[PDB]
Structure 1
Amino acid sequence: AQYEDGKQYTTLEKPVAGAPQVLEFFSFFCPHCYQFEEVLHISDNVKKKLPEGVKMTKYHVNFMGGDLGKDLTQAWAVAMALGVEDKVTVPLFEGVQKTQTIRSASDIRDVFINAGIKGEEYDAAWNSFVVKSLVAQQEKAAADVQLRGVPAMFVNGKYQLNPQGMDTSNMDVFVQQYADTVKYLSEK
């Protein structure tokens, strides 16, 4: 076939019932994740090729960067609750990997302030039980798939993208193969 299990994707030995349709995992400490966001724009190109009726989910993980890694998972919960993902994603990536100006929870907080989220609003969210349960959801989703590596994408809790098996000669061709694979898997 043109799309082969173990080639552009792998199948989960134990499928995850009720899982989000398109589920992506990342870390602000993860170098290919930085590429996926800034240079390749994977999430957005997947969206553009996904059918109608499909929701896309993106979660942060704890297993990179120790204590700061966990702060970042809570901060991403804050971003999701406030709906400000598209305003903090880039400065968070750059603060961690490019400028290395993010070293504490206060520095994460500065990124939200500079993006125009108000201190009051940020701290209330940070401390809210809605963010607590949002952190729980991120952890549970990752736990459900025994996740030990990022970036990662899962389709319908059954299939996991395998970018290792795609030509990286051309970044544009790579992104399209990736997106086309998500679509194929979506329709499966």
Structure 2
Amino acid sequence: AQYEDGKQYTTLEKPVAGAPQVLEFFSFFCPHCYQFEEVLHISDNVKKKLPEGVKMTKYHVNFMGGDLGKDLTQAWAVAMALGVEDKVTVPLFEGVQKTQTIRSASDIRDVFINAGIKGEEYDAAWNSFVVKSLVAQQEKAAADVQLRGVPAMFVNGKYQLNPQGMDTSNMDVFVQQYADTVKYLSEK
């Protein structure tokens, strides 16, 4: 078998029902997550290898960064509620890891302000029960698979990507193996 459990992916002991087709977990504090987003563009290359109907879901996690870690998960909920993931992902990553200018909830907000989101919209979304729910959903999804590491990707609540079984001498080969794997799992 060219794909085998334990190599390119692992299988969940207890599967999760009702999960999204493709589910990614990441942390703006997470060094490999910065690489998947800015250097390797994992999500985008996965997306391009799937049918157009497949739903990709990406969630932030709490277990890195203490207080800011949770602030970031609420802010990611704001980003999803407002639909501006594509406007704030890069500045969030660089604020936390490149310039290290994100050191409080107020600096996170600055990112959205600079990115074009009006102060009133941000604060209204930040404090909304819609966002509280989106925070709960992110947490719940993570809880379902006892997530202790990011970046992580799960396919149909049953399969987890195992980047440790993939060649890393070449960034492009590595993301294609990763993307081709997601496609193979999406079809099991």
Per the TM superposition, whether the score is higher than 0.5 is yes
**Counterpart in 2 of 1:29?**
29
How far is 1:52 from its partner? 3.2
When structure 1 is superposed on structure 2, of 67-76 and 46-55 the one drifting more is: 46-55
How far is 1:125 from its partner? 0.1
How far is 1:51 from its partner? 1.6
The runs of at least 4 aligned residues of structure 1 exceeding 3 Å deviation read: none
Amino-acid identity (%): 100
Partner secondary structure for residue 48 of structure 1: helix
Name the CA distance, whole Å, in 2 between partners of 1:68 and 1:175. 29
When structure 1 is superposed on structure 2, of 92-101 and 44-53 the one drifting more is: 44-53
The TM-score normalised by the length of structure 1 is 1.00
RMSD value over aligned CA atoms? 0.4
How far is 1:53 from its partner? 1.6
Name the CA distance, whole Å, in 2 between partners of 1:118 and 1:2. 50
Name the CA distance, whole Å, in 2 between partners of 1:140 and 1:120. 28
The TM-score normalised by the length of structure 2 is 1.00
Name the CA distance, whole Å, in 1 between partners of 2:173 and 2:182. 14
Alignment of 1:168 onto 2:168: yes
> Which runs of 5 or more residues in structure 1 are unaligned?
none
Residue by residue over 1:32-78, the C-alpha shift from the partner in whole angstroms, topping out at 9 and shown as x without a partner, is 00000000000000000012320000000000000000000000000
How far is 1:164 from its partner? 0.5
**Counterpart in 2 of 1:5?**
5
Residue by residue over 1:4-46, the C-alpha shift from the partner in whole angstroms, topping out at 9 and shown as x without a partner, is 0000000000000000000000000000000000000000000
> Which runs of 5 or more residues in structure 2 are unaligned?
none
Partner secondary structure for residue 45 of structure 2: helix
Residue by residue over 1:65-109, the C-alpha shift from the partner in whole angstroms, topping out at 9 and shown as x without a partner, is 000000000000000000000000000000000000000000000
Partner secondary structure for residue 147 of structure 2: coil
Residue by residue over 1:87-139, the C-alpha shift from the partner in whole angstroms, topping out at 9 and shown as x without a partner, is 00000000000000000000000000000000000000000000000000000
